[PDB]
Amino acid sequence: NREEKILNREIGFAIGMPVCEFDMVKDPEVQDFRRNILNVCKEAVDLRDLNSPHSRAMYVYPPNVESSPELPKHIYNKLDKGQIIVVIWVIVSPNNDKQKYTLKINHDCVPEQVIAEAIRKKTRSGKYILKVCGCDEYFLEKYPLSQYKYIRSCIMLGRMPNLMLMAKESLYSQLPMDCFTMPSYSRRTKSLWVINSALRIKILCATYVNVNIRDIDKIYVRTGIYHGGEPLCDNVNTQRVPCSNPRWNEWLNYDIYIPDLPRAARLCLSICSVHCPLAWGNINLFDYTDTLVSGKMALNLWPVPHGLEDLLNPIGVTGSNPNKETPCLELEFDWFSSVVKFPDMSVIEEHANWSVSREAGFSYSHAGLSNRLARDNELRENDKEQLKAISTRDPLSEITEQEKDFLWSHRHYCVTIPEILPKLLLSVKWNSRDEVAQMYCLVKDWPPIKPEQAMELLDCNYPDPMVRGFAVRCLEKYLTDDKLSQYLIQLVQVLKYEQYLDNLLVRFLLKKALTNQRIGHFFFWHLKSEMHNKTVSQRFGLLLESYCRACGMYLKHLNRQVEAMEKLINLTDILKQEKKDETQKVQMKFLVEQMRRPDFMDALQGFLSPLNPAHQLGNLRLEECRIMSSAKRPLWLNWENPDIMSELLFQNNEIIFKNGDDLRQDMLTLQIIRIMENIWQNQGLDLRMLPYGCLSIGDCVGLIEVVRNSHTIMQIQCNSHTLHQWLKDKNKGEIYDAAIDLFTRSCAGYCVATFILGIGDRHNSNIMVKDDGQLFHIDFGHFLDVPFVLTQDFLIVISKGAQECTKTREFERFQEMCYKAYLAIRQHANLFINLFSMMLGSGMPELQSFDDIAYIRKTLALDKTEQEALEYFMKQMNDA
């Protein structure tokens, strides 16, 4: 058709990849994915069409609400007699005439109740909705007004809520309807258990294996069978062969029997020199149709990632390298006269139910022969008490083989403490179909666990699809849209661990992206920002294709953002190329020259901010745009806020564009800070952090939010009393007390957060202070390594200029904030551990092994008691 060719052009421009390149791939998994995923698209579109048009406005403008309607004490105490003061704005004439009506109402009022009170005091002389003044956020559901994050924050900050009445007809008429069309491209045996053979694989020859004859005599193929990074048997190598003729023609035998192969079994192989590795690759032993791979097949290998001292790379992704001009290794698997598939769930349930009756046969005498079969043995309360103690340890405490045998034995009891499932799963012998079949039935009826606990089951050491299917069940039952957005970074990353294109995790995330457009925005950009990475570009490219067909009109607004970013990349590439050594003035002349060409001049104005799509980026104030003093030439960009009420929120939107630095680390560290702030605010501990906008949009390219009215400590010094005098100066009179209080709280938060996270390299140019006293750190490149950090400059401010701070009462109140903030994060240690664990396959440099993560066990003292952990942080703080 004709409309389909335009839509494919729009999809291709958004992804940076022509749709026809997807059509060219003859891998049937690819084509099946492109068709089979389309039911998620129709379900999502139908969810947006049931109860139109309010259904599609919910989609485009979801409520921005907190997790729970309950308010902490320090929040409620902001509100005398449970009453909030809210200003409601109405425009009487089409000339944008302002009329404010101030209201005093209960915080739990639905937006309809706030419209009623506003319309009654409008007349003192069901057709409207509330909009946040200054940005495209709406209050469409019947949430308690205090539960919306904007209203909650206005209570938190002691700032005045500014809202606007707007008729429903206004918003609805500006939301175009979605005409999702199904595309022209959707319309297109013996079990393993009955095979008693040992596994053997044929390593025949290798091509494109050019390598320097210097320091190379012989080369050889190292293989290994793994299940999620743990070997199922011994690694078997091939025999050394000459470098000029890479032929082995060798069948390798492995200590594992075929019916015991787990579903997620993978062949991890590599080519190694003689005694270093050259290139690696992984193959799934089963395809996406549950078929034991049989026959000849060739694998294009991957270059060794810098830092890989091992010989195999079992955590790297699986599949052939798309660059077919790389080392290519040829393999052959046994055919067994028939198509071999993995047994049905009914066959597994039979074998497992059979296996439980074999237990009651064996009785108590036989139970002695195996420590893992302690089911028949009677269980003292010590056993129940040890299982409880095991279930309460962090996801990275070592589980001994005694404990693993102890866990398998009591699995019918572990169902009663479902939080122990992760450690239980780690106790299975995954190379025993007898045990695994029996674990499946446990997982089949396992009680749901918290989303924060289930996310662990999606990282790099739970590859089994039944384990991961249970994990998605949990998120799909308890994970709120708020928490989904909060954790979206990690949930996108764990898609890389998935063994196949079509899988329950991606169907979950895609459906939520296509029913919640705040989520779909960052879903898009987190995927788009890594299309340059060839290990996942095809995976994310196909997933982006299906998204762009069903997200609706927002595809047009996304392309609008993509070309904006693309012009900024091209323009900054030309600066780093042709004017990199010129003065900043010569660079600015060239910048203003390039920016005033007509094609560029609208590509970058009249689009939505990728940092926050509620923010509209109107006209560009070139007079306020500058190349920044930093290296890599950051662009200070300034747009007009075209909103009618821009003066009540922010009149200019200031964003830094940075080309050259990997921003994934800043984006992650600020996520952790935001979550830590959320934990502290829920426990009534008002420690004000500033998790500040930072989005990676591509390979060492991204956007950074500007916080206004802030200065670095180094500039403020331009005496240890110097900082405090600046704060006294900026904050005279009654403001002094609130300002000192704001600095002490923000300092406590960042002291604790930087200590826990091992945030080193902190100097007076990495710590800024706002005019209202808000301290906050910056440039989070390095992290997880450093001791507790408190300069004398900070302490003088806390004690309001006193000589000894330890002596004053304010330092006592400062410490209790830290100890409480420290113990609050420690009580949520599993959350942060799992979040970092999910980031291991990301390819991020500073999160590549569990050794990198072990440092938060040390700073949080998880192997000690909450007493002795507090004393450790008692000491770490007084060490100054």
Author numbering: 107 to 231, 248 to 310, 324 to 409, 419 to 862, 873 to 939, 952 to 1046
Give me lines lifted from the publication on this model.
Class IA PI3Ks signal downstream of tyrosine kinases, G protein-coupled receptors and small GTPases to regulate cell metabolism, growth, proliferation and migration. They consist of a p110α, β or δ catalytic subunit and a p85 regulatory subunit (further referred to as PI3Kα, PI3Kβ and PI3Kδ), with a broad tissue distribution (p110α, p110β) or enriched in leukocytes (p110δ). PI3Kα phosphorylates PIP2 in the plasma membrane to PtdIns(3,4,5)P3 (or PIP3), which can be converted by 5-phosphatases to PtdIns(3,4)P2. Here we report on the discovery of UCL-TRO-1938 (further referred to as 1938), a small molecule activator of the PI3Kα isoform, a critical effector of growth factor signalling.
We next used a deletion variant of p110α (p110α AA105-1048)30 in which the p85 adaptor-binding domain (AA1-104) and a C-terminal membrane binding motif in the kinase domain (AA1049-1068) were deleted. This construct lacks catalytic activity but, in contrast to wild-type p110α, is stable in the absence of p8530. Co-crystallisation with 1938 did not yield crystals, however, soaking preformed crystals with 1938 revealed density for 1938.
